[PDB]
A paper describes a structure:
Strikingly, however, replacing the morpholine with acetate caused an increase in selectivity for a pyridine core (9c) and a sharp decrease for a phenyl core (8c). The electron density, however, is weak for the tail group extension of 9c and indicates multiple conformations. Two copies of 9c were built into each active site. However, the tail group and extension of 9c are unstably bound, with six conformations modeled. Of these, two consistent conformers (observed in more than one chain) have the amide carbonyl directed either toward the side chain of Asn365 or that of Ser319. The carboxylate does not appear to form hydrogen bonds with the protein. In the presence of the 9c dynamics, the His213 side chain adopts both inwardly and outwardly pointing rotamers (A and B, respectively), but considering all three asymmetric unit copies, samples the B state with higher occupancy. The pyridine of 9c draws a water molecule closer through hydrogen bonding thereby enabling the incorporation of an extra water. Within the complex with 9c, the N4 ammonium interacts electrostatically with the side chains of Asn161 and Thr197 and the carboxylate of Leu410 but is situated in closer proximity to the side chains.
N-myristoyltransferase (NMT) is a promising antimalarial drug target. NMT cotranslationally transfers the myristate moiety of myristoyl-coenzyme A (MyrCoA) to Gly2 of protein substrates after removal of the N-terminal methionine.17−19P. vivax and P. falciparum express a single NMT protein, whereas human cells express two closely related isotypes, HsNMT1 and HsNMT2.20PvNMT and PfNMT have more than 80% shared identity, while the human orthologs are only about 40% identical in sequence to PvNMT and PfNMT. Small-molecule inhibitors bind both PvNMT and HsNMT1 in the peptide binding cleft, where residues contacting the ligands via side chain atoms share 100% sequence identity. The inhibitor binding site is located within the peptide binding cleft formed by the N- and C-terminal domains.
Numbering used by the authors: 27 to 410
The structure:
């Protein structure tokens, strides 16, 4: 079908471009020609600009997502982003409040739809372009398949265009026209009994309960003994270490110093970053963020508390040793499982460190940009 997406500046499902192509579908755009009127909504619905710095507006978004956002392929789990997490993810440097858009049902004054974007500098095939990073598209379950999502997309495109920005980046679990890369996800069990009780991990005659507990047990000693929580004094060094690491990839964000402080300085129950400092220099770093999933229907446990691999760089140890420490630090902060995508160098440690393959993949997309696609080991960016 793709009745909507084939009207947009994106590749068709069979399009394929070679390395000589790296440019927009539509160039020479003028801000003056962008529509000045908001898109029409059905009778009884209105646009609403959300202020995520206000606790009440932030809680309205939280409630919408907790009840209606992404579920796994089998409808066992639903993401449960915390309200503090949403604050962090949506207030990066130079964010625009008018790019946090909602749709209200006027008769009850309830939020039933949402989409957001934040500005970012993206390097694709060595070209750096100012882009919007789009996320948290959600329509209330009672209003699905009514073609409301295309309206949310067109309205946010209009508002991004009004700022003279014409490219975007986004990720989704569903296959749309057309991914630039596609990355399976993997899991590493930490709380073995909990994962068994909820029916996610499986046992058999070879892998009994006691053997599984033994298999996934980790030693409580760090390979990099001076790993410690990142502080404001570490921003400059993390900026240099991560910047140098990311330049090898075909797709990655170009961070400013201010952006490094926002995305990595630790926040309890949201973002964790550890560093190894030697001779005044940051030589190694580990980071992971907190994203629990609701266990739908379970009356014993509210959530599975997962840590998600963010950005990890090592110069004094092997990558296997570094990610072994990452798992231990997640365990020390009481996380139940450590999740990761097959981007950057992550695939090289999955077998040895006893990760298990998931049942789906995350696709990476660009809007109004045509280029060759690439394997996910060349992806160097993680969206939230
Ligand atoms: C330069 C600036 C540009 C900025 C804009 C950049 C583009 C941004 C695009 C968005 C980036 C978002 C990044 C994230 O947040 S990805 C996570 C998305 N959210 C969820 O999965 C939560 C649970 N599900 C829902 O809330 C609804 O099912 C959604 C809202 C997903 C669709 O609602 P509904 O189920 O009620 O359907 P409809 O009848 O209204 O509309 C049908 C059309 O929608 C196309 N569809 C389905 N799923 C997605 C999807 N995940 N990305 C893009 N398009 C999608 C579908 O192919 C069809 O098009 P076509 O096949 O007819 O052509
Ligand atoms: C789909 C899902 C998963 C599968 C894990 O999916 C990932 C694993 C690692 C990284 N990313 C993803 C992922 C998959 C689909 N969409 C996204 N998005 C949407 C678009 N914006 C960015 C984020 C991310 C889990 C889960 O892991 N439970 C813990 C356990 O089973 O152990 N719970 N649910 C609801
Ligand atoms: Cl085609
Ligand atoms: Cl103009
Ligand atoms: Cl309207
Ligand atoms: Cl709701
Ligand atoms: Cl559903
Ligand atoms: Cl239209
Ligand atoms: Cl068996
Ligand atoms: Cl400090
Ligand atoms: Cl719980
Ligand atoms: Cl390898
Ligand atoms: Cl596996
Ligand atoms: Cl490739
Ligand atoms: Cl790969």
């Amino acid at each position: 079908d793709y009745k909507f997406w084939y009207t947009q500046p994106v590749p068709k499902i069979n399009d394929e471009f070679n390395e000589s192509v790296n440019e927009p579908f539509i160039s020479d755009n003028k801000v003056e020609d962008v529509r000045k009127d908001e898109y029409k909504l059905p009778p009884g619905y209105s646009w609403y600009v959300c202020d995520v710095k206000d606790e009440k507006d932030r809680s309205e978004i939280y409630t919408l997502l907790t009840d209606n956002y992404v579920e796994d392929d089998d409808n066992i789990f639903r993401f449960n982003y915390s309200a503090e997490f949403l604050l962090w993810a949506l207030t990066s440097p130079n964010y625009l409040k008018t790019w946090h858009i909602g749709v209200k049902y006027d008769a009850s004054n309830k939020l039933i739809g949402f989409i957001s974007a934040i500005p970012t500098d993206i390097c694709i095939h060595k070209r750096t372009i100012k882009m919007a990073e789009v996320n948290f598209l959600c329509v209330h379950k009672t209003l699905r398949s009514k073609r409301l999502a295309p309206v949310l997309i067109k309205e946010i495109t209009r508002r991004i265009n009004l700022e003279n920005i014409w490219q975007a980046i986004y990720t989704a679990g569903v296959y749309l026209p057309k991914p630039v890369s596609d990355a399976r996800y993997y899991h590493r069990s930490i709380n073995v009994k909990k994962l068994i009780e909820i029916g996610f991990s499986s046992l058999n005659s070879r892998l009994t309960m006691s053997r599984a507990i033994k298999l996934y047990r980790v030693e409580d000693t760090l390979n990099i003994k001076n790993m410690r929580l990142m502080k404001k004094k570490d921003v400059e060094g993390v900026h240099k270490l991560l910047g140098s690491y990311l330049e090898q990839f075909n797709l990655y964000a170009v961070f400013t110093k201010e952006e490094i402080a926002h995305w990595f300085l630790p926040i309890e129950n949201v973002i964790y970053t550890y560093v190894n400092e030697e001779n005044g220099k940051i030589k190694d770093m580990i980071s992971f963020y907190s994203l629990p999933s609701q266990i739908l229907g379970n009356d014993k446990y509210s959530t599975l508390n997962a840590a998600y691999s963010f950005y990890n760089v090592t110069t004094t140890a092997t990558f296997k040793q570094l990610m072994q420490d990452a798992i231990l630090l997640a365990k020390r902060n009481n996380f139940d499982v450590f999740n990761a995508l097959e981007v950057m160098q992550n695939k090289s440690v999955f077998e040895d460190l006893k990760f298990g393959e998931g049942d789906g993949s995350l696709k990476y997309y660009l809007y109004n940009w045509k280029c060759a696609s690439f394997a996910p080991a060349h992806v160097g960016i993680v969206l939230l």
